Amino acid sequence: RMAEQQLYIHGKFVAATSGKTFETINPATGEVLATVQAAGREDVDRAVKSAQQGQKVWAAMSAMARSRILRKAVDILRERNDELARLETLDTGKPLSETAAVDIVTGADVLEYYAGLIPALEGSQIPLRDSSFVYTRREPLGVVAGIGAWNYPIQIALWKSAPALAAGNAMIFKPSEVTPLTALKLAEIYREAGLPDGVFNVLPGIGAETGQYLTEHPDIAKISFTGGVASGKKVMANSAASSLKEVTMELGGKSPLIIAEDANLDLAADIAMMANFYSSGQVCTNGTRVFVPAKFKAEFEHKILERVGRIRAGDLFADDTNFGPLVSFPHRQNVLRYIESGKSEGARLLCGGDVLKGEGFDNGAWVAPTVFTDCTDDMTIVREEIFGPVMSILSYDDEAEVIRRANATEYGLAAGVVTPDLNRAHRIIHQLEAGICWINSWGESPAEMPVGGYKHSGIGRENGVMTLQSYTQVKSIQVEMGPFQSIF
Amino acid sequence: MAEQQLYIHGKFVAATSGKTFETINPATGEVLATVQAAGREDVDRAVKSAQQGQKVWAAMSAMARSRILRKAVDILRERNDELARLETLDTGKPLSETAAVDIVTGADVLEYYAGLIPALEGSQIPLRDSSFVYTRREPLGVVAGIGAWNYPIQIALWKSAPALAAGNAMIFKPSEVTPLTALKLAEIYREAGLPDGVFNVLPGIGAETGQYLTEHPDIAKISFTGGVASGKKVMANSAASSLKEVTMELGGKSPLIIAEDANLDLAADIAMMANFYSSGQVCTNGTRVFVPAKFKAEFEHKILERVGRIRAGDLFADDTNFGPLVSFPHRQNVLRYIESGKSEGARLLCGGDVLKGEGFDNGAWVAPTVFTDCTDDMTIVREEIFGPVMSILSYDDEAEVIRRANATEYGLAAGVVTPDLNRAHRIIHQLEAGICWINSWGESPAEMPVGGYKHSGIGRENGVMTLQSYTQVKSIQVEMGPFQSIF
Amino acid sequence: RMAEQQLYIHGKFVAATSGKTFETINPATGEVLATVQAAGREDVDRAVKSAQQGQKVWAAMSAMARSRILRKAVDILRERNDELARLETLDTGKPLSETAAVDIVTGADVLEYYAGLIPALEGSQIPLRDSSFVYTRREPLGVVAGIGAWNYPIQIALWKSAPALAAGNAMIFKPSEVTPLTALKLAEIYREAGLPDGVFNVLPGIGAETGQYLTEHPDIAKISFTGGVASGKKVMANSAASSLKEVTMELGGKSPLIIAEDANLDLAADIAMMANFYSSGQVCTNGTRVFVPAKFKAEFEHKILERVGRIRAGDLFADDTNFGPLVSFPHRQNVLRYIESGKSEGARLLCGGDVLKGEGFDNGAWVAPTVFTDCTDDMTIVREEIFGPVMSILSYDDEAEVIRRANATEYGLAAGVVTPDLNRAHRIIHQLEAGICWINSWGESPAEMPVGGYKHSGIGRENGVMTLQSYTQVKSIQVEMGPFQSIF
Amino acid sequence: RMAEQQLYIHGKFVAATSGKTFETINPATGEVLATVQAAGREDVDRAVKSAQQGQKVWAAMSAMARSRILRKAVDILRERNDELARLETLDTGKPLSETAAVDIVTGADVLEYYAGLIPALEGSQIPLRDSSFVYTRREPLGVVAGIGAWNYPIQIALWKSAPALAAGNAMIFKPSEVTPLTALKLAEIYREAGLPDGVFNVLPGIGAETGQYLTEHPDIAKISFTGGVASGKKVMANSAASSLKEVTMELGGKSPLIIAEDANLDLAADIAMMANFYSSGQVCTNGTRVFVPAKFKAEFEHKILERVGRIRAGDLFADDTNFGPLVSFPHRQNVLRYIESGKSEGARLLCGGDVLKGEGFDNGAWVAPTVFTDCTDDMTIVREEIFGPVMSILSYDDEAEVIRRANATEYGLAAGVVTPDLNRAHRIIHQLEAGICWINSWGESPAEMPVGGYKHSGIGRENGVMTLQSYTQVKSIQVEMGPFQSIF
Ligand SMILES: Nc1nc2c(ncn2[C@@H]2O[C@H](COP(=O)(O)O)[C@@H](O)[C@H]2O)c(=O)[nH]1
Ligand SMILES: Nc1nc2c(ncn2[C@@H]2O[C@H](COP(=O)(O)O)[C@@H](O)[C@H]2O)c(=O)[nH]1
Ligand SMILES: Nc1nc2c(ncn2[C@@H]2O[C@H](COP(=O)(O)O)[C@@H](O)[C@H]2O)c(=O)[nH]1
Ligand SMILES: [Cl-]
């Protein structure tokens, strides 16, 4: 077993003063991975004052000095990629085949990206007249808070802290109570790279206490939240009631995958598989509404079933395992409730629909890869994000119809189209009300590419140059060199 | 005047609320007009009208949109005086202000954004020979603006100009105190060729019409200007309902720092313009004036001399430069703060009472008021008054004044008066405010982003960035290589 | 006959002091349109001193004051579009069906575009440390010169003067001696719009004198030239040798049009026609090397023959005329020599190849629309810009081959591909060495879109936000607020 | 002495086929440092073909892969700083106190800066209408050539190669024949960092042969030149006559230092010293015209004499040496000619004016720190760049006068003002016709700050984000999804 996990405040581990702890479970076995201390209201106050002190040191350094420190953190993350991925697999249940290739690789890609952009962060200068001009400064916000989710723990920590730190802020990061372990490791790595004490503090805890204490704190200038749509609305409200914080939200979706009448169905089946069953379906951007032309539906169903049969659940550290248990046993219960609603509302179950059983599965939170067909737009499984391995296949007749049905949702995160035709690909994508659109692919999220939701799926964006800027605030300065005229 | 209706889809329409309210002329106490209030059903009609207009509007070319907004600018320039007189009647601000500032600078911002529409561009990012990303800056759709009463038509233009320029339709709710010019603007936009529904105006009260807007599920963004308390309610309800993007321009308690090397005639002029324009009803006003102790007595003399030249009177008279407050309930709140200053030991330098006599007894007048000997714990020093109440505070050294200038939950504006190169930039760089003026006050060019730090605001208005903030980024990856599935 | 045309200097017409004149001819009839004064060395020096004085007034105005004046000029151009187009047709020989729909419309579009961008022209601000920061100004160059070509006289005058003026400069414009008339009209329009005197001066003359005097003048900060590749090299040399001027050059090309194996051949033929025979083939961006798959070549040739048979030469003011004479008898002589070279080098003449004869044609320099096929990469007509209505059709077998052959040229101006396939369209275009690339279209040049040549086809760009910036020069300013340390 | 120095082509040293060599002299002793092979016409052609091959590999890599390789070159340069600085001191005669603190540090600072910006290099996307859009690519130019100067050999090589490589190009670099050695070392360092073979080739040689072969080559797309005004005009002409290359030129200046009437004269004297005597006056940006108010002139002259007496010439490797010989004996002869010109025209010699003599100086190309006063705007030493340690002090009476005199020159490189007054500093700087402006300082050139000349002092800029973009060329691509309409 691991040692009791403490808070990370001001460059060292420190005991919480809340007197409270929680446990994180290994979802493959049900065993306790670690007991974790929970940050109380006073621990949060201590973290903010640590962050205020560190942020001043960090911002006073030169831009290239900050760049070099983050680059050293990148180097450590590349060296420790396999070790960090193994820890992430234990905490999340995701196969090592995923965590060692994606989670830290792409988290570090984003930190590496923003490290190089720090010196390009510039204000503007605006001439008004010969005797007066304006210039702007992109100043740090100060202390910002990141609230992470459990499906990509260290990647989310990196995607939130990289731009925040790169812009000259300190960040207090609260990982999900489900998956707190890699965030604490990241804090140690940042310190090892030379990040000033206090610039990245980590506070494990539960949302109702530690999360709320951060969102309410008067000296936190911005909150960045990743999680479910409902919890997001609550976070965003509480941030306004306290001190009118800036907000960023990356929430869930019900993203449509549109298969065009001229699509190759093997390619379409491969994209739908990767859009539904990666990380056991626990991805906010998953293409869980798969729209297929009626004339191709039966053949598409056959190709999905063939690929589903190739899914390899088992030992999460085995090279050939590509499917894991869900992150927790309560989450499995929620996915199973959705599956039962699909059955009772008349969707046709093509495969899966139950837990996995037998040696090596009975103690883990496993759900079989599940595919429903003959789905309709009013069904619960079609309208609501499930966050488990459940694909809904929907038939359609014409392009105008599928665009309307694709857009007829409160969600807005991602979308995609499969077509070899130039006009159809751009024409359709331009009409879809989603922030992340994939043509003949799914899932790739380059550090350069801003990502976030339309409508109820988000506020603001992550990644790209714009996100570095969104972690600064503009100060406009007018220099008046002419004589000032008063009307009094 | 005739009973004022809602403006929905290019025409005046009766409200379905069965409710009305009155707007009072603050100079006479008389009712200017009865105004229909938009109910929950009216808001839904406005949204559906806005959805229809926005699609027509967004389908036009960028230059087609530019030309239509430019035509609205031409109409606003022509009707500057007519609109200003209506603004004066509704707000109590002197015609000397409304005819020179309110429509002029409102139109300036609309004109600025009209020209930037064709420059609104996405990006393209190569990943590898076989895949690239490009982005679109798409309209949000239907957005809502909630205006304040101190600059009714200017606020309406500063919100609607970037929103319309970005391809959105806007539903605008003016303050119930000052609803009249927003309705005039709606007619002007239509006359310019704005498609029906792209700018709808829904007068009403904040507790009903404003709340219905913040709650509507099909509104993508709310832009609010007003007080801090009302703002927190707006931003909460916008999140609880449909997770709207939000922009907030709130009040402040902005510091004016007079340096030890400042010319005191210049410093006094800046302090005057920072406190008594629009009778002190300006969000950015420099209501905490920090003066070095060694010059405090002389500065107080120079302020008193200039206060003596203030000309209250007929708001349509050329030489009038001071008006009544926007309403009698607001005057009562301002008087509550003034009495707080007296009881907490601040020294009254001038004013502090209502104005009396022929032509003033019927208006909501408060005399220009100056407190000195102020300390950082006083209520008048800590809280926004939004009336003509200057607070003068003494200081000894530069480090102190910076700490005290920043020791506030507000973050809107700030300024320094000094002829020294290093001092001006050095001090300004350390102040926690979004709008900083050196050797001046109040100028807000269309090019210059403005908004608050800390409790004074969220987001910005004006400048290129605000046009972008009325769009949403769509990222599109083109994968020309063979897609690899691990299953 | 028109009245004698004078120089335009400092807001009024003025006699040249050179004592020299030239005539501009109506290319449809041979009649003298007007006698035109030629600017001498002293006239250029007067124009520069006028421009220097006007530029200071212009640059001192507010940004929106400049914007409003250029917009008034736009409004005048819209109102007089048909009158100016008729003058352009008389001077150039291009059909009114073209000049009234393109030349002034698109010239004014660019002026309107830049008029609106003036307030967005901004510098930068760069923090170095707490005690020092840098800011930049985008200052006007001062006095710049534009040298126009004869195929699009007023359009070029607008595309050069609009960004130059919007950036705060004065421009001295030298129109082609072939086509000086609309530039003089534009100068009056600017003044009527409120442009300060001296900000746009126009100096007709011949290239060997007036053009050379401008390129040599020591107080002209930049030369922008449109013309042939050969003449361009001469101008760029003289500008460097005299005073080290900044330079922009829009030269000719031999642009490839690649027809993919999956293209609809009616669409491909329509694009090829528009890419070769608009303005009687006198267009720098024309797609004069048409690459067609071997298996479709015969059918494509038939479709070209059918469309060529529809070309309607005749009265240039008639609605149905869509083909005009070449601008002059010397230019037709050169085109005729290229046609004869094609015949003698073994290319197969598909149609045309001769002068037009008979009533209405004997007085103009008309050449029949000409198409050569069976062309090979070594032929003179394939390698060299003809600037007449001469299409070369080349067969190809595979995609790698056609990209190689398309790129095997010193020219670099434009290119295009015809294909409905998403991957093919972007994949091919990304490999073509040209600045202006069209997918399933040809010729459109939006004000927003920077256009210019690779390799020998140009230096710099016109249109787009970047061209406004390129008519400014960057000044960097460091404010050092810390104590300066000397090592001596 | 060193072994015969070879060319660097395609990742290795290779013997030249020209049969020609030249020698580089140690300016402190007159000894031959090394015999160096000169690249011939055939050698330039091999280098270009090597560069074309390397550039294709380099450009095909990911952006972050290119960033990492340039960052490894940075790390090696930091490590080998002292070794490289000693070599630079031997080759240039600049004191080790300079070369070890400035030359490699600031060269590497720029490489490090551009390494981080590679992922931020983005094109644009422009919607035209629902059925058509434009997007742009910032493509590499291909093979570019940089031609270096002798005063900052490795710094110039880094400032040219860093943006060029970061933008995806290969560069062929020709160092000055006076100082060829550190460029060859840089070529090895790049390869050691993982730069693909051919991406950075170094061709020592003379300007009239090797330099000309580069400017003439048809497959080099851009020339970047740093040197004198005269040779620049020659280079820019030959580049146009051959293949219409893009050009950047960083030439000399006669930059003014304006001392305001409210300036502290100790600060002004310190700024004037650093603006004139660093690198023994061999800096293009030097403030060689020092304008002082008449009322302060006598006191300022005394303060200059005091500080000139503190200059410590001697052993270039001694810690306390801060002044060196000139780069070569022929260059000293030209500097002496300028000094005699000052005497013959009646300028008053305040100090210096002769060679240094005695043990340790008789064998080196030493010139004493020289200050002329009572200078006027028509004097040769005032009008012409000397590129030696020669300060000219000019009296003035009022602000308008000094701005006019500061600007009355063909040069435009730098300028500066000394004043504590807010309005005066910005007011004056905004009116000066120079690209590089310093307030209350001199000489600092941050990687973020674009630098280059107005008027005859240059074309284009170096450093800053704009210089990364200027090493790409814009390709505009229109996607037309609507039906194309032909008028034929
Ligand atoms: N998008 C998203 N949804 C989540 C996440 N965690 C839980 N959910 C969703 O929220 C609900 C349960 O959340 P809980 O109340 O257990 O935190 C379920 O609908 C579940 O799918 C998360 O990290 N991201
Ligand atoms: N690209 C281009 N070529 C031109 C232009 N004017 C003339 N030429 C070319 O120059 C040659 C003869 O014209 P000249 O410039 O000698 O009068 C021919 O090759 C002709 O096509 C022009 O404006 N653009
Ligand atoms: N600005 C500048 N001038 C130079 C440079 N090298 C030589 N010069 C100047 O050019 C002239 C000729 O010197 P040369 O080029 O033959 O060494 C002299 O006035 C010399 O000072 C250089 O690298 N930069
Ligand atoms: Cl491990």
Ligand SMILES: [Cl-]
């Ligand atoms: Cl009236």
